[PDB]
Amino acid sequence: PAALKRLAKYVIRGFYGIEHALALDILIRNSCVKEEDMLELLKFDRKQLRSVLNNLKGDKFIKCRMRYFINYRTLVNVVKYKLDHMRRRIETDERDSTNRASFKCPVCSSTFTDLEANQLFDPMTGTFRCTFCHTEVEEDESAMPKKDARTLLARFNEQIEPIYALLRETEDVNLAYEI
Amino acid sequence: TLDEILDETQHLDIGLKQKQWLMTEALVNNPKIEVIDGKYAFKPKYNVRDKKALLRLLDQHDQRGLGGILLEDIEEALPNSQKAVKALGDQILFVNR
Numbered sequence: 324p325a326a327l328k329r330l331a332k333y334v335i336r337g338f339y340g341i342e343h344a345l346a347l348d349i350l351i352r353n354s355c356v357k358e359e360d361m362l363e364l365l366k367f368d369r370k371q372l373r374s375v376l377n378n379l380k381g382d383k384f385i386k387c388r389m390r391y392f393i394n395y396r397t398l399v400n401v402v403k404y405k406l407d408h409m410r411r412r413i414e415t416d417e418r419d420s421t422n423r424a425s426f427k428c429p430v431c432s433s434t435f436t437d438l439e440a441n442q443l444f445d446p447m448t449g450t451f452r453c454t455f456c457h458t459e460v461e462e463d464e465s466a467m468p469k470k471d472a473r474t475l476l477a478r479f480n481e482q483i484e485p486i487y488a489l490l491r492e493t494e495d496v497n498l499a500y501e502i
Numbered sequence: 503t504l505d506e507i508l509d510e511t512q513h514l515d516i517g518l519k520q521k522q523w524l525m526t527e528a529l530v531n532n533p534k535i536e537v538i539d540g541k542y543a544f545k546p547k548y549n550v551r552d553k554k555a556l557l558r559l560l561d562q563h564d565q566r567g568l569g570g571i572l573l574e575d576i577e578e579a580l581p582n583s584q585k586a587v588k589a590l591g592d593q594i595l596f597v598n599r
């Protein structure tokens with residue numbers, strides 16, 4: 324599991340911050356990890372160390388082995404857990420509606436569908452007139468830039484895979500090594 | 503030596519009794535007095551305060567950086583900061599809890 328500690332080297336790099344990461348570095352050696360030793364070594368605060376440990380406990384990152392004196396060992400199989408749910412939420416914000424180019428009247432900032440201004444469509448002017456005011460309609464304008472968000476997320480969320488490729492690959496090859 | 507300190511501080515007339523008690527006992531109850539022989543030296547910091555080149559401690563990858571403490575710092579010509587910026591420029595990393 325030396326390359327299992329390598330997926331770990333890449334997640335600490337990829338995610339948790341210096342204060343967390345320094346503690347996580349100690350977690351590297353899964354031989355013996357007491358609370359008094361880790362406190363004295365990290366040169367951290369006891370309340371604060373307890374917060375980080377409690378945070379790591381929340382990850383189920385560690386299996387608190389009681390004597391009382393403690394020991395801590397990896398539990399996260401949630402690398403997929405962050406993945407399946409995050410991909411869902413990003414694909415929700417990505418998947419847009421349609422051209423959804425509803426007429427919108429710039430004077431009253433009222434919103435219409437292509438259907439809304441179609442009933443309004445004024446045959447004497449060959450264009451679309453707003454309802455209560457005859458001022459000509461415009462594009463959905465700003466409204467929801469879900470299409471720009473789709474493009475951005477795609478570049479941004481899938482652009483972090485290459486830098487994660489080292490670990491996405493190590494994990495995959497390490498899991499195969501574990502059998 | 504205590505006599506040399508007395509001398510330099512012009513406090514030599516502390517009385518032979520006190521002088522002696524200081525020399526034999528004050529500098530004996532001293533925690534881990536690093537004293538090769540005649541002359542007393544610095545005990546806490548093993549390394550000379552030279553404000554530079556702790557690459558040995560950086561490459562000492564056996565204790566995750568060896569608890570680099572700030573207690574033995576900021577008392578030099580540059581308040582750690584000047585060294586740190588170069589320390590920032592170099593591998594040296596600074597943080598606080």
Ligand SMILES: [Zn+2]
Binds near residue numbers: 432453454456
């Ligand atoms: Zn209008």
